[PDB]
Enzyme design. Structure first.
Site, mmCIF file in Angstrom:
data_model
loop_
_atom_site.group_PDB
_atom_site.id
_atom_site.type_symbol
_atom_site.label_atom_id
_atom_site.label_comp_id
_atom_site.label_asym_id
_atom_site.label_seq_id
_atom_site.Cartn_x
_atom_site.Cartn_y
_atom_site.Cartn_z
ATOM 1 N N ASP A 160 1.080 6.814 10.780
ATOM 2 C CA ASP A 160 2.075 5.761 10.959
ATOM 3 C C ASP A 160 3.419 6.073 10.311
ATOM 4 O O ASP A 160 4.437 5.493 10.714
ATOM 5 C CB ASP A 160 1.540 4.440 10.411
ATOM 6 C CG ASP A 160 1.034 4.570 8.995
ATOM 7 O OD1 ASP A 160 1.848 4.478 8.065
ATOM 8 O OD2 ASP A 160 -0.163 4.832 8.838
ATOM 9 N N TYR A 163 0.827 -1.198 0.000
ATOM 10 C CA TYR A 163 0.000 0.000 0.000
ATOM 11 C C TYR A 163 0.869 1.258 0.000
ATOM 12 O O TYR A 163 0.632 2.184 -0.785
ATOM 13 C CB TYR A 163 -0.888 -0.014 1.247
ATOM 14 C CG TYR A 163 -1.682 1.236 1.485
ATOM 15 C CD1 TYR A 163 -2.841 1.484 0.795
ATOM 16 C CD2 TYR A 163 -1.283 2.161 2.430
ATOM 17 C CE1 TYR A 163 -3.602 2.639 1.025
ATOM 18 C CE2 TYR A 163 -2.030 3.312 2.665
ATOM 19 C CZ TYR A 163 -3.190 3.541 1.987
ATOM 20 O OH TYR A 163 -3.953 4.677 2.210
ATOM 21 N N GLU A 167 -1.904 15.183 10.377
ATOM 22 C CA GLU A 167 -2.498 14.022 11.038
ATOM 23 C C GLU A 167 -3.303 14.522 12.233
ATOM 24 O O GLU A 167 -2.793 15.298 13.050
ATOM 25 C CB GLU A 167 -1.388 13.039 11.477
ATOM 26 C CG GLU A 167 -1.771 12.051 12.597
ATOM 27 C CD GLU A 167 -2.857 11.063 12.160
ATOM 28 O OE1 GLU A 167 -2.568 10.251 11.253
ATOM 29 O OE2 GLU A 167 -3.978 11.133 12.702
ATOM 30 N N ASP A 213 -3.933 9.628 2.811
ATOM 31 C CA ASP A 213 -3.775 8.326 3.422
ATOM 32 C C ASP A 213 -4.646 8.293 4.673
ATOM 33 O O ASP A 213 -4.154 8.289 5.804
ATOM 34 C CB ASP A 213 -2.318 8.048 3.751
ATOM 35 C CG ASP A 213 -2.118 6.676 4.374
ATOM 36 O OD1 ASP A 213 -2.987 5.772 4.227
ATOM 37 O OD2 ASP A 213 -1.092 6.488 5.028
ATOM 38 N N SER A 214 -5.957 8.303 4.452
ATOM 39 C CA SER A 214 -6.945 8.410 5.512
ATOM 40 C C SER A 214 -7.362 7.038 6.018
ATOM 41 O O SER A 214 -7.248 6.017 5.322
ATOM 42 C CB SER A 214 -8.192 9.132 5.013
ATOM 43 O OG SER A 214 -8.749 8.408 3.911
ATOM 44 N N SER A 215 -7.872 7.034 7.242
ATOM 45 C CA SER A 215 -8.700 5.928 7.716
ATOM 46 C C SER A 215 -10.057 5.983 6.999
ATOM 47 O O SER A 215 -10.280 6.782 6.086
ATOM 48 C CB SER A 215 -8.811 6.009 9.232
ATOM 49 O OG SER A 215 -9.185 7.329 9.619
ATOM 50 N N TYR A 222 -6.435 -5.779 4.100
ATOM 51 C CA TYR A 222 -7.582 -4.889 3.991
ATOM 52 C C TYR A 222 -8.784 -5.691 3.493
ATOM 53 O O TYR A 222 -8.602 -6.718 2.825
ATOM 54 C CB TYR A 222 -7.318 -3.727 3.039
ATOM 55 C CG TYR A 222 -6.335 -2.672 3.559
ATOM 56 C CD1 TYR A 222 -6.102 -2.493 4.916
ATOM 57 C CD2 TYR A 222 -5.660 -1.855 2.668
ATOM 58 C CE1 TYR A 222 -5.190 -1.508 5.376
ATOM 59 C CE2 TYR A 222 -4.765 -0.883 3.124
ATOM 60 C CZ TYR A 222 -4.539 -0.717 4.456
ATOM 61 O OH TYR A 222 -3.627 0.264 4.863
HETATM 62 C C1 LIG Z 1 -3.004 5.149 10.303
HETATM 63 S S1 LIG Z 1 -3.002 6.120 8.733
HETATM 64 C C2 LIG Z 1 -4.669 6.868 8.616
HETATM 65 C C3 LIG Z 1 -4.693 8.174 9.514
HETATM 66 O O1 LIG Z 1 -5.627 8.977 9.054
HETATM 67 C C4 LIG Z 1 -5.887 9.896 10.290
HETATM 68 N N1 LIG Z 1 -7.005 10.745 10.054
HETATM 69 C C5 LIG Z 1 -8.290 10.359 10.113
HETATM 70 N N2 LIG Z 1 -9.061 11.424 9.901
HETATM 71 C C6 LIG Z 1 -8.215 12.492 9.690
HETATM 72 C C7 LIG Z 1 -8.476 13.830 9.422
HETATM 73 N N3 LIG Z 1 -9.647 14.570 9.274
HETATM 74 N N4 LIG Z 1 -7.456 14.705 9.288
HETATM 75 C C8 LIG Z 1 -6.194 14.251 9.399
HETATM 76 N N5 LIG Z 1 -5.911 12.927 9.638
HETATM 77 C C9 LIG Z 1 -6.962 12.073 9.805
HETATM 78 C C10 LIG Z 1 -6.163 8.974 11.228
HETATM 79 O O2 LIG Z 1 -6.024 9.495 12.594
HETATM 80 C C11 LIG Z 1 -5.101 7.862 10.976
HETATM 81 O O3 LIG Z 1 -3.928 7.951 11.750
HETATM 82 N N1 LIG Z 2 -1.014 4.140 6.394
HETATM 83 C C1 LIG Z 2 -1.767 2.940 6.718
HETATM 84 C C2 LIG Z 2 -3.056 2.934 5.926
HETATM 85 C C3 LIG Z 2 -4.298 3.579 6.534
HETATM 86 N N2 LIG Z 2 -5.306 3.469 5.456
HETATM 87 C C4 LIG Z 2 -6.159 2.252 5.525
HETATM 88 C C5 LIG Z 2 -6.857 1.994 4.170
HETATM 89 C C6 LIG Z 2 -7.939 0.899 4.186
HETATM 90 C C7 LIG Z 2 -8.915 0.972 5.375
HETATM 91 N N3 LIG Z 2 -9.783 -0.227 5.459
HETATM 92 C C8 LIG Z 2 -11.052 -0.042 4.743
HETATM 93 C C9 LIG Z 2 -11.068 -0.493 3.258
HETATM 94 C C10 LIG Z 2 -12.383 -0.118 2.559
HETATM 95 N N4 LIG Z 2 -12.420 1.309 2.261
HETATM 96 C C11 LIG Z 2 -8.147 1.174 6.692
HETATM 97 C C12 LIG Z 2 -7.181 2.372 6.651
#
Ligand SMILES: CSC[C@H]1O[C@@H](n2cnc3c(N)ncnc32)[C@H](O)[C@@H]1O
Ligand SMILES: NCCCN[C@H]1CC[C@H](NCCCN)CC1
Ligand SMILES: CSC[C@H]1O[C@@H](n2cnc3c(N)ncnc32)[C@H](O)[C@@H]1O
Ligand SMILES: NCCCN[C@H]1CC[C@H](NCCCN)CC1
Lengths: 281, 281
Positions: free
Chosen positions: A87, A62, A107, A156-158, A224
């Protein structure tokens, strides 16, 4: 030994599980539930709100594809923004480019950075690089206020449930457009093509309101859901992101484990049913 | 509602689970434990010895890539053998080719055929085609005795634990070689690149003792472990299987959901670490 199981309303009716060797850390941060554990076969695992964010065994797939697809297309990228990515995996890949002058990362959750520095040292090593600048802020607000424009933005969002709920809408992609140089590129993590195509369609529609070229790529990654994740690719030029403009031949890239010049383009060759779904967007 | 969980020593430490809407059928056949159930989100599911063989939601990805990769490379295939494949998915895709004159299938377990005819009618419909001939036999023995040679052989086996244990060795690929026409092709289901690369290396080594060209392709499919599965591709010509020789334009192929002309070649563009592992085989 117990098992960790990833259940979610975001992928109802299916779940992936990893056997737990040892739990390492848990906390409720200001924004989300954080879990770190050593799995028996995938190494250490970072979990946010019950959703696997990365494992040591496969995170390179990824992080390399998200970084090197846009960084080999941009010709001389100087200023790069990572949204999310606490991360540090994207930063780690970005640091390999000697031509980069500045890397901003926005972040929202400082706990994620600190946990990765403690428990994931081969992923967060890029924070030592003097070009990296950290902003602890909602990227929705950072992007409204930033004065600089960027050559590349990597989102690179959650997932959309939680703090990242502000990153999956039209207004967000307008902020991204304005924060990019006239020839700038944005890539963003996007829904798996085996789950909610409707969401992929929504994001593409948003990006196309602003970007001349909007492409979707696929990454194989086993931890994932459904084993893959998309890259939404946004270009202001009509040449797009499917073809690299450089080969990664210097010694900094001898360690690459997934990305190469041929995979870059192959990732954009999508299954027939998906092509059909996005056709009239 | 209960859940079905796929645990195996073949992929220790991980498991994928599907929520069960209704159990439809279970039996211990002469060869293996058979389970059929309706899942809540993937449709009906066939399980052999605890291992998911197919689901209605995603089986087209595997059956189309396994069939149409070799069937668009062979120029005028007349006689095709399926090894395993009791569910009929490969046969269904093969029947679309009007030029095929005969389809043999050698399946060891007649229960699998009968169950698929009863519970998976849109997968086993190809058994009605008058070109299909069924042999209930261990393919290890069928291949030793068959007098005909084939244009294409598709090895659609279950995993190496169970009756398919006879299909993953050097002697087997010698039987395959001899049962092929001088310009014939074989594809076989092969280990996921995220699990046992050592096994992929073993199979490639076997095929290369006999075949001039041996290539490995990857298929995205969420209900196989790690979300993908390989295609071992064996050619007697040095041109191999990466480039199709025809486009699938007749009306029989208007329904395709995964395969297309560009995906065919893209499936062979592998991650860097795997290329490195197979280099000196
Ligand atoms: C682990 S990599 C994904 C990251 O996206 C971060 N993240 C989620 N929402 C936001 C947002 N609105 N702004 C900045 N970072 C975010 C999350 O806290 C997580 O660490
Ligand atoms: N830097 C680590 C990656 C954080 N992004 C991840 C991308 C996939 C997500 N699962 C959901 C997949 C379906 N959208 C978890 C966070
Ligand atoms: C469901 S598709 C996979 C099929 O491969 C069949 N199979 C497993 N081993 C053999 C074997 N030696 N010979 C023929 N078919 C087999 C299995 O019974 C299964 O139906
Ligand atoms: N015709 C339905 C397909 C039967 N082949 C399946 C291929 C994958 C296998 N899981 C194991 C994956 C790792 N080798 C189950 C049988």
């Amino acid at each position: 030994k117990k098992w960790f199981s990833e259940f979610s309303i975001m992928w109802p009716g299916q779940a992936f599980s990893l056997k737990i060797k040892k739990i390492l850390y848990e906390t409720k941060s200001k924004y989300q539930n954080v879990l770190v554990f050593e799995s028996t076969t995938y190494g250490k695992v970072l979990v946010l709100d019950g959703v696997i964010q990365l494992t040591e065994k496969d995170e390179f797939a990824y992080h390399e594809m998200m970084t090197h697809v846009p960084m080999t297309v941009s010709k001389e990228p100087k200023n790069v923004l990572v949204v999310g990515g606490g991360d540090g995996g994207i930063i780690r890949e970005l640091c390999k480019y000697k031509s980069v002058e500045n890397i901003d990362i926005c972040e929202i959750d400082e706990t994620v950075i600190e946990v990765s520095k403690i428990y994931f040292k081969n992923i967060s090593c890029g924070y030592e690089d003097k070009r990296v600048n950290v902003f602890i802020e909602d990227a929705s607000k950072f992007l409204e206020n930033v004065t600089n424009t960027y050559d590349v933005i990597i989102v690179d969002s959650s997932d959309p449930i939680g703090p990242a709920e502000t990153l999956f809408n039209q207004n967000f992609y307008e902020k991204i457009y304005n924060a990019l140089k006239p020839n700038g590129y944005c890539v963003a993590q996007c829904e798996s093509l085996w789950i909610h195509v409707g969401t992929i369609k929504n994001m593409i529609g948003y990006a196309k309101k602003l970007f001349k070229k909007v492409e979707y790529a696929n990454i194989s990654i086993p931890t994932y859901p459904c084993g893959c994740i998309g890259i939404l690719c946004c270009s202001k030029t009509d040449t797009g992101l499917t073809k690299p403009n450089k080969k990664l031949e210097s010694k900094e890239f001898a360690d690459l484990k997934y990305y190469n010049y041929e995979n870059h383009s192959a990732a954009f060759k999508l299954p027939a049913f998906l092509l059909k779904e996005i056709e009239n967007i």
